[PDB]
Each structure stands twice: as C-alpha cells, then as structure tokens.
C-alpha cells in the first residue's frame, strides 16, 4: 500500500487476481481530497488526456501498471479495479510517497492549559516536527509508567515544500487522574535519531 520514490524513478505496480479476468482490470488515480479518475481501462487502454508515461499491461491473472519516469504530479494513490463475473473488487490502494533524506523530529511537549484544568479534563500534547520517514513511534511515560490507550496520534500528509511529516500525539486524562503523577515523559524514536529523545516535565 506504500512505495517511496523520487522524480525520475520508474515504478511498476503489480495487481494479481484469483481467477482469470482476461482484460477487465482498470487503473484509477486518486489524489488527497478528490474523487478518482481513470487512467487505464481494458487492462491497457490509456484514457484520453493521461500522459504517455503510463503503461498498462498483463492479461489473465497478473496485471501491471508502470510509470516510466515519475514527475511531480504523479505522486498520488493508485487503485486497480477488478470487474468481472468472478470477482468485482477494488484495490487496497498503493500510495507513491515522495522520497527524501532522513530528518530528525524536533520534539515539543505541552502540559495542560490552566484554562483546561478548570474543565475536569487534562490533555498533554507532544509534537514531532518535520521528519522523514513517516515511521516513528512515540511512547508515553508517567512516573516511569508506560502508557497505551489514552494517547491519540495524528500525522499530516507529506509537506508540499519540505516533503516531511509532522505527528501530534495527545495524552488526555481526567483532572483527578492528572494530579496523581509527577513525571510526564514523551519518548520518541526515529530513523534519524541517534538515540531516542525524551521530553519530560514535572508538574
């Protein structure tokens, strides 16, 4: 579902099938926030207007879709569509991400606002800023107690100008449960981190 490549690489996406769907697999392209558009139909038929890098092949069971040289506006998600009397499926989807060199996450921690504690809920924000690759894991510690179920990661799409991600894990407690603990540590490990960074605070 995910492939990382840079402009000028050639990528080819295979899409196998269970039975024999002959020539009835289509390819669609979807960009974040918009409906799908068809690129190839009938296994190999480029739709009018789509550039000539795109090249569909295969018949019977194994089907491919190639881009001979990637361009900036090529970085989107590609679903193959089976549509037969045997199977009538779409794809998991395959996302082509724009490749860059590893970046170390700039970390930040945010204890609850004074105004928020007046509400009975106490939410702790951690922040990972401008990193590549996306693969990074945060780990919440409260007084050396490891947390797993109150946090909620959410990460952005690759930045238009940095080609980097930013992740924001938010730990939310009740005002009461918040007052029982001293250390609020947010440990993050990344590809571009020589040793895992921890950004703690004592209440």
């Amino acid at each position: 579902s995910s492939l990382s490549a840079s402009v000028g690489d050639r990528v080819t996406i295979t899409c196998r099938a269970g039975q024999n769907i002959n020539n009835y697999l289509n390819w669609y392209q979807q960009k974040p926030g918009k409906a799908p558009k068809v690129l190839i139909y009938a296994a190999s038929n480029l739709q009018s207007g789509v550039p000539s890098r795109f090249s569909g092949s295969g018949s019977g069971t194994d089907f491919t879709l190639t881009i001979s040289s990637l361009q900036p506006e090529d970085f989107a998600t590609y679903y193959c569509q089976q549509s037969h009397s045997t199977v009538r499926t779409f794809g998991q989807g395959t996302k082509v991400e724009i490749k860059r060199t590893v970046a170390a996450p700039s970390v930040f921690i945010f204890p609850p606002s004074d105004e928020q504690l007046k509400s009975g809920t106490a939410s702790v924000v951690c922040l990972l800023n401008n990193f590549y690759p996306r693969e990074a894991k945060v780990q919440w510690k409260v007084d050396n107690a490891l947390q797993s179920g109150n946090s909620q990661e959410s990460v952005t799409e690759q930045d238009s100008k940095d080609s980097t991600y930013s992740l924001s894990s938010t730990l939310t407690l009740s005002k009461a449960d918040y007052e029982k603990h001293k250390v609020y540590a947010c440990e993050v490990t990344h590809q571009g981190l020589s040793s895992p960074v921890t950004k703690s605070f004592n209440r």
Partner: protein
C-alpha cells in the same frame, strides 16, 4: 456523463435514512448509467450499486442487498441513492460515476467508471452539534499552538494572527474520541526572540455552530 454533480454533506443519526443525488448535468446523459462507489475514511473503495439495463431498476452489492435503493430519474437525469438503517460503519464519502459497460453476463452490467462525482460526505454518529473548546499551548526555533478539543461535526477552520502567519503553521487532521467529538491541534514554530516581542493569536471558526473563537498564546 460530463459533469456528475452531487448533493452535499449530510450529517445523520444511527438507524436513519440518507438520500443522496447525483446531477449528471451537461451534454447527453443517461441517469440509468450511474453507479455508486463508497469510500470509507482512510482506506479504499467498494462499489455499492448500479441499474439494470434490461429492467431499469437498481442492482446492488451483496453487502447492501437489504436497504439500498438507487433510482434513476431519466427526465431530470439524476440518480438518487437512498441508504437506510444507517450505522456508524456506514460513515464514508459516497461517489457516483458513469458506468461504461464492457461485459454484462447476468442482468447487471459492469466494466469501468469514467466521470466521478465530486462526492458527498455522510457523517453518521449518535452525537449532536457542539462548539469547539480552545486551549492555548505556550512556548518555552520555539513552537506554540492551540488545542481545539471538543466539537462536532467535522468542519473547522484555524487561522493565526487573523491570517498573517502562514509559515510553519500546521493544523493536524482531527481525531475522533470515544466520546464522539472531534479534537485537533494546530502548532507553529517561531523564533525564540519574538517571544513577548510578537503576540501570537489563533482564530478558530466552527460554522456548524456559528462559533468563532480566538485565543492568544503567551509563554
């Protein structure tokens, strides 16, 4: 066929009924040629239904052979999609698309889809409208932000300094709490000399509740 145009966003409640239109405007069209594919947030596609050429009435997926009913108004050239017994798993973006038939070896035709509608979002939760809560996030290359923590439904805008600040601003995709409300956080990285020397204010507008709140951040 040229300009599939869909109705608009609908918030609904579990157990309820939505009816979504697909206009199919412009040149020569066949409203009986529209199908309906559905996309559930964060993941892939599943076709829901089409219309039988030999009968003029709908044909739906096995997973919806229950309470789905697509109807084709040949004169006004629109396709209405009615999904009832709405559940929470039915929250998705619902597309219409014109089917180009290639093989029909049942009573149903299927092949490939060319124009796709712009898509309407059907958010269905047991929750009800609520305005957001803004909580500042103070600084110590220094970051600051705002926490928008409990609102419903999805659409919410975040600005900084009433529109000036657009550099290092982020605003993350919202997450949905087990409670049912949405919370997102927006941060910005700024220099450590403009702390106090420049005041940072974020603007949050939640139109579903006509809630326009601004909360400034100080160290």
């Amino acid at each position: 066929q040229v300009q599939l145009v869909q109705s608009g966003a609908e918030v609904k409640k579990p157990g309820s009924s939505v009816k979504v239109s697909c206009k199919a405007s412009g040149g020569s069209f066949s409203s009986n040629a529209i199908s309906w594919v559905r996309q559930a947030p964060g993941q892939g596609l599943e076709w829901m239904g089409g219309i039988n050429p030999v009968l003029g009435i709908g044909n739906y997926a096995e997973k919806f052979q229950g309470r789905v009913t697509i109807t084709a108004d040949n004169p006004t050239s629109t396709s209405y999609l009615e999904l009832r017994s709405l559940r929470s798993e039915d929250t998705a973006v619902y597309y219409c698309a014109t089917l180009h038939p290639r093989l029909c070896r049942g009573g149903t035709c299927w092949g490939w889809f060319d124009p796709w509608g712009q898509g309407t979002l059907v958010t269905v939760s047991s929750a009800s409208t609520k305005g957001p809560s803004v909580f500042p996030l103070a600084p110590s290359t220094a970051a600051l932000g705002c926490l928008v923590k409990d609102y419903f439904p999805e659409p919410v805008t975040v600005s900084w300094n009433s529109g000036a600040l657009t550099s290092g601003v982020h605003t993350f995709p919202a997450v949905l709490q087990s409670s049912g409300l949405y919370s997102l956080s927006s941060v910005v990285t700024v220099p450590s000399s403009s702390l106090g020397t420049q005041t940072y204010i974020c603007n949050v507008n939640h139109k579903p509740s006509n809630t326009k709140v601004d909360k400034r951040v100080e160290p």
